[PDB]
Ligand binder design. Structure first.
Ligand SMILES: *[C@@H]1O[C@H](CO)[C@@H](O[C@@H]2O[C@H](CO)[C@@H](O[C@@H]3O[C@H](CO)[C@@H](O)[C@H](O)[C@@H]3O)[C@H](O)[C@H]2NC(C)=O)[C@H](O)[C@H]1NC(C)=O
Ligand SMILES: *[C@@H]1O[C@H](CO)[C@@H](O[C@@H]2O[C@H](CO)[C@@H](O)[C@H](O)[C@H]2NC(C)=O)[C@H](O)[C@H]1NC(C)=O
Ligand SMILES: *[C@@H]1O[C@H](CO)[C@@H](O[C@@H]2O[C@H](CO)[C@@H](O)[C@H](O)[C@H]2NC(C)=O)[C@H](O)[C@H]1NC(C)=O
Ligand SMILES: *[C@@H]1O[C@H](CO)[C@@H](O[C@@H]2O[C@H](CO)[C@@H](O)[C@H](O)[C@H]2NC(C)=O)[C@H](O)[C@H]1NC(C)=O
Ligand SMILES: *[C@@H]1O[C@H](CO)[C@@H](O[C@@H]2O[C@H](CO)[C@@H](O)[C@H](O)[C@H]2NC(C)=O)[C@H](O)[C@H]1NC(C)=O
Ligand SMILES: *[C@@H]1O[C@H](CO)[C@@H](O)[C@H](O)[C@H]1NC(C)=O
Ligand SMILES: *[C@@H]1O[C@H](CO)[C@@H](O)[C@H](O)[C@H]1NC(C)=O
Ligand SMILES: *[C@@H]1O[C@H](CO)[C@@H](O)[C@H](O)[C@H]1NC(C)=O
Ligand SMILES: *[C@@H]1O[C@H](CO)[C@@H](O)[C@H](O)[C@H]1NC(C)=O
Ligand SMILES: *[C@@H]1O[C@H](CO)[C@@H](O)[C@H](O)[C@H]1NC(C)=O
Lengths: 49, 271, 49, 346, 46, 37, 49, 65, 50, 50
């Protein structure tokens, strides 16, 4: 519905901060794993024995 | 005459063709507007008028369709370019526009009349009243008239080395007509192309004529050979207009220093 | 249609708020998990229980 | 009152907000006083036909619409997007009066988003049209006993007209596939037909003189403002202003803005006209709302004592003291001028 | 048919930056460090 | 994550500069072009 | 390296900027200026407007 | 094709002529067109009512197609 | 509406005319002229990032 | 008015321009549907009470 989008454009920038909040949440989720797991600078390998 | 058809040329529009979308003053803000605009780096026609074959008339004045707007511009030196006549069908029946530049008068005329096969103006004043009205026979039913100061305030070339860059954007919406202009000299013209610079176009008149316009025609101002009818060297550019979204950057003084398109490229959309 | 748009927009805003609250809770849990990993896997912790 | 308790514990409390009430009101309008020629439009001997509706250009004049309300006892004045009295009150820039004559059956066709033979063929209104339509009976004025044929209306055309577009086409209609370039038998037809107004018809078929006004309210130059007395401008004071209908309260001061000749209204980051141009003798002016802020109380507790201290949040003491007779809100609520020394904190 | 309905209403899911294989590699590296080095690898060279 | 256009994939490993998703990251490296890895 | 403090400052500034720019939203209204509406619409319609 | 098609073609053609006379700004010629056309609608209402439509009573038609 | 019309295996009963999904929106429609069942799906849109 | 007639109309094509071009005097106040949109989209059941 193009006309619905046209009339929604009059509502101002409301999807901007919603998109920003969702992107920030996604980045936070990525950083959570990056911080909890990537705590070693080297990938140590167990010996064959 | 038996003029031979010339191949159309194209030129990059660059970052040209931006005008103030409203009378409201904004300073030090990055405003985004949705209006008719000329896309950045767009192909624009490169019509060039000159005395071909060293004395043969060149009728490079085609009936360019108006569509939604034009970006008429030139690197004109002296007053040889005149006339921005419009017309739906370009006959006696159809009501049509008329914009002469006789000396220092625009004389905006909206009347329906017949048009000559090759309308033109005479730059030199007629001796001893003037035959400059050869473009049309006589107006029949006149609806609107407007006389004012000339649309150009540029000084004459004098010795030379400098030419004007009169840029015009014509917009016809909701039974209205609007005019924007801006002039500036040019330093080097070896490629004969629009400079890679930013220029802001300001409104100067609004025409409330609610007329159907579908074709655009331009005229020339040549008096006589100095065989037949000849003129000097000149060129004008036309750029078609389509709806676009533009982000305008106002400075402290309120002029548009630069602007960025929204659909030219992914970087532009990101901006 | 404005009534419908307002309702849908409010529903989206409520969903975003719930997502933000859940993201804050998950971030707290991830910070606790990272602290536990650092203090128990990378070393021996004298903290009781 | 804020805590809803007769006893207040010690601490800081935010009660309300203080605002400098305007000292007076000033109205600024263009000083041109010539009356607009609306009487000529509404009193013309004969109106133009509907297909070729006349367009009238109105500028640099003051228009009093009250004459329309008082006179012409029979009229229809249903208006779009503006109140009548407020229309008399507010300002305009591009006012245009169109006049034509149609029957009383199709008077409703002069409206945005409506279909009909005149609506589609003769005169079309934009969907976002702002302005009034004025219609009145003209059976006495425009109906000869034999018949009135001067008024012509269009009935056939290939495509509908855009809003605010006038067609004076007289070419032969293309009713059929075959071209004829002239009126003939099978299918040639003619685009516009004629009226036959006579007094003997009923009210539905009686002629009606319809006048429509085109209005746009951006009002940057505001050359056709209505009848309003212009008072002397007041600078550097919280005074109500009426610059070309821009009702509001604030402090007007000289501006460093370099307005371009076409530019008339200044604005800010968020849709606030912080700069205005005087409709009178040219003067670029800034608009700033007069001093406001939060009001806080530093009571040490009701039990300990009734003495209180007031903290005005984020306002310089010099320009907004307590002893000014301007009565900056709550006239009875006022601290003593020199009860204690006034301390200016960050 | 459940994810498709949400996707058709503009409700997409962004994949995580770290795949399961990389998380498993991190866990294996942590196991190797805590087995072959104790707590020394957590405060410098293993 | 999806379809990537404008970058070249290389059989090399580097630190993540621009996180694309699912273990792919992009960077501006050597003439000069955007590389995904 | 002070990403967190500048990030918090940017969040606060962006929230304030969004809140002040939200006044440009028509929300489906005839205009975004209360004074203009009160100067052109009658109170019966200006109330809902 | 009976007679209604021809009658309405006659109506449209003489309405076009009425427009011609009105634009020509000559009164009597338009008035005689008005009498002729009103006689035409009288013929229309007579024919639609079931009564036979006269042919010689109405003025001689032009070279209609 | 706007979408891609394809063949549908969703067996419409003789009285059945329309067809919805879990998302409480129309998903299938029967042709008003021929007794043919179609499922309407929006053409792929996705999202773009730079 | 007390014994208002009820007429059932169905399985037919409806054109509402007859009420528009003809019947010069009327009152076409309508609820829940635009007049042109009344004439445009498909209905199923119409009840006529006079
Ligand atoms: C272009 O201009 C000519 C000249 O006026 C128009 O021709 C005139 O058209 C009108 C209406 O069709 C008529 O004028 C009438 O003429 C009679 C004398 O015949 C005179 O009493 C009035 O002046 C009256 O208005 C007439 O056909 C014609 N006038 C003449 C003198 O030939 C023509 O209509 C115009 N073109 C358009 C498209 O309007
Ligand atoms: C302005 O006039 C042009 C004719 O030059 C109109 O274009 C016609 O439009 C109809 C319907 O859109 C088509 O059926 C015709 O074929 C068009 N004519 C030609 C020559 O192509 C146009 O509709 C008019 N109005 C505008 C542009 O608003
Ligand atoms: C350009 O042409 C217009 C129209 O032809 C000239 O307008 C004339 O203005 C004078 C003075 O206002 C009038 O007395 C004439 O009636 C106008 N029309 C004419 C002469 O046809 C205008 O003067 C011309 N420009 C210059 C510089 O002379
Ligand atoms: C805005 O306007 C000011 C005021 O004129 C400009 O400042 C002048 O700039 C010129 C050269 O650019 C100097 O010669 C003057 O001395 C300046 N005057 C003042 C008062 O500063 C300024 O350049 C304009 N443009 C911008 C972007 O500020
Ligand atoms: C049109 O003309 C009439 C009279 O020809 C104007 O009527 C005015 O008001 C009353 C009539 O009841 C009388 O005082 C005079 O007839 C007029 N007085 C003045 C001061 O004009 C009417 O104002 C004119 N204009 C319209 C109707 O718009
Ligand atoms: C512009 O015209 C030239 C001339 O043929 C052509 O090569 C080029 O592709 C055109 N560019 C655009 C954007 O149309
Ligand atoms: C009237 O207004 C004009 C506006 O340009 C101004 O120039 C002129 O001085 C004013 N005159 C008076 C008497 O106010
Ligand atoms: C104020 O508080 C003190 C502390 O409890 C109490 O003893 C005293 O009675 C209070 N004042 C009054 C007037 O009750
Ligand atoms: C208050 O205003 C006075 C006079 O303008 C000035 O001297 C003083 O510095 C101002 N104080 C503050 C805090 O701005
Ligand atoms: C990169 O690896 C792929 C395996 O997916 C292989 O097909 C390709 O040839 C390799 N390219 C180079 C340059 O090693």
């Amino acid at each position: 519905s193009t006309e619905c989008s046209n009339l929604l454009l009059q509502y101002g920038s409301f999807c901007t901060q919603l998109k920003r909040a969702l992107t920030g949440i996604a980045v936070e989720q990525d950083k959570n794993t990056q911080e909890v797991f990537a705590q070693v600078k080297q990938i140590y390998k167990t010996p064959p024995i | 005459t038996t003029r031979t058809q010339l191949p159309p040329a194209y030129t990059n529009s660059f970052t040209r063709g931006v005008y103030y979308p409203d009378k409201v003053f904004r300073s030090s803000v990055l405003h985004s507007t949705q209006d008719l605009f000329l896309p950045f780096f767009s192909n624009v026609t490169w019509f060039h008028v000159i005395s071909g074959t060293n004395g043969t008339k060149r009728f490079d004045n085609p009936v360019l369709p108006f569509n939604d707007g034009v970006y008429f511009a030139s690197i004109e030196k002296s007053n040889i370019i005149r006339g921005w006549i419009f017309g739906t069908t370009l006959d006696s029946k159809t009501q049509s526009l008329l914009i002469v530049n006789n000396a220092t008068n625009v004389v905006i005329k909206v009347c329906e009349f017949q048009f000559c096969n090759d309308p033109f103006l005479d730059h030199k004043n007629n001796k001893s009243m003037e035959s400059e009205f050869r473009v049309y026979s006589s107006a029949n039913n006149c609806t609107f008239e407007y006389v004012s100061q000339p649309f150009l305030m540029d000084l004459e070339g004098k010795q030379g080395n400098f030419k004007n860059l009169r840029e015009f954007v014509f917009k016809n919406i909701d039974g209205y007509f609007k005019i924007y202009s801006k002039h500036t000299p040019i330093i080097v013209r070896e490629p004969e192309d629009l400079p890679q610079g930013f220029s802001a176009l300001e409104p100067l008149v609004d025409l409330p004529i609610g007329i159907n316009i579908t074709r655009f025609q331009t005229l020339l101002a040549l008096h006589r050979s100095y065989s037949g009818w000849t003129a000097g060297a000149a060129a004008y550019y036309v750029g078609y207009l389509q709806p676009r979204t533009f982000l305008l950057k106002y400075n402290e003084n309120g002029t548009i220093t630069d602007a960025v398109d929204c659909a030219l490229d992914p970087l532009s959309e990101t901006k | 249609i404005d009534r419908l748009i307002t309702g849908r927009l409010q529903s989206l805003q409520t969903y975003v708020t719930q997502q933000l609250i859940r993201a804050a809770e998950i971030r707290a849990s991830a910070n606790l998990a990272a602290t536990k990993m650092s203090e128990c896997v990378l070393g021996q912790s004298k903290r009781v229980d | 009152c804020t805590l809803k308790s007769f006893t207040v514990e010690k601490g800081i409390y935010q009660t309300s907000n203080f605002r400098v009430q305007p000292t007076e009101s000033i109205v600024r309008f263009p000083n041109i006083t010539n009356l607009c020629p609306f009487d000529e439009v509404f009193n013309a001997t004969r109106f133009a036909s509907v297909y070729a509706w006349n367009r009238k250009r109105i500028s640099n004049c003051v228009a009093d619409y009250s004459v329309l309300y008082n006179l012409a006892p029979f009229f229809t004045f249903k208006c779009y997007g503006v109140s009548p009295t407020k229309l008399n009150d507010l300002c305009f820039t591009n006012v245009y009066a169109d006049s034509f004559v149609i029957r009383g059956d199709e008077v409703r066709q002069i409206a945005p988003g409506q279909t009909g033979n005149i609506a589609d063929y003769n005169y079309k209104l934009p969907d976002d049209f702002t302005g009034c339509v004025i219609a009145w009976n003209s059976n006495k004025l425009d109906s000869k006993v034999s018949g009135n044929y001067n008024y012509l209306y269009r009935l056939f055309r290939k495509s509908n007209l855009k809003p605010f577009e006038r067609d004076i086409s007289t070419e032969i209609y293309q009713a059929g596939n075959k071209p004829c370039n002239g009126v003939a038998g099978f299918n040639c037809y003619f685009p516009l037909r004629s009226y036959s107004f006579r007094p003997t018809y009923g009210v539905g078929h009686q002629p009606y003189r319809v006048v429509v006004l085109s209005f746009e309210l951006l009002h940057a130059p505001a050359t056709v403002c209505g009848p309003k007395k212009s008072t002397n401008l007041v600078k550097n004071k919280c005074v109500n202003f009426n610059f070309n209908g821009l009702k509001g309260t604030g402090v007007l001061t000289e501006s460093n803005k370099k307005f371009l000749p076409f530019q008339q209204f200044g604005r800010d980051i968020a849709d606030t006209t912080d700069a205005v141009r005087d409709p009178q003798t040219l003067e670029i002016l800034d608009i700033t709302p007069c001093s406001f802020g939060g009001v806080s109380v530093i009571t040490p507790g009701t039990n300990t004592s009734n003495q209180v201290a007031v903290l005005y949040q984020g306002v310089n003491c010099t320009e907004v003291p307590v002893a000014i007779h301007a009565d900056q809100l709550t006239p009875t609520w006022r601290v003593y001028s020199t009860g204690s020394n006034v301390f200016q904190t960050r | 048919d459940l994810i498709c309905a949400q996707k058709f209403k503009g409700l997409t899911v962004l994949p995580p930056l770290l795949t399961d294989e990389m998380i498993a590699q991190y866990t294996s590296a942590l196991l190797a460090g805590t087995i072959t080095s104790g707590w020394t690898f957590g405060a410098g060279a293993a | 994550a999806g379809c990537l256009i404008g970058a070249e994939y290389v059989n090399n490993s580097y630190e993540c500069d621009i996180p694309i998703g699912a273990g792919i990251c992009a960077s501006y490296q050597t003439s000069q072009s955007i590389i995904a890895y | 390296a002070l990403g967190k403090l500048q990030d918090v400052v940017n969040h606060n500034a962006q929230a304030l900027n969004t809140l002040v720019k939200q006044l440009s939203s028509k929300f489906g209204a005839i205009s975004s200026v209360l004074n203009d509406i009160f100067s052109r619409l009658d109170p019966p319609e200006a109330e809902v407007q | 094709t009976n007679m209604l098609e021809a009658l309405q073609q006659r109506l449209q053609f003489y309405h076009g002529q009425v427009a011609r006379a009105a634009l020509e700004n000559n009164s009597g010629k338009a008035r005689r067109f008005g009498r002729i056309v009103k006689q035409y609608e009288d013929a229309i209402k007579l024919y639609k009512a079931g009564k036979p439509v006269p042919y010689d009573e109405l003025p001689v038609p032009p070279g209609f197609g």
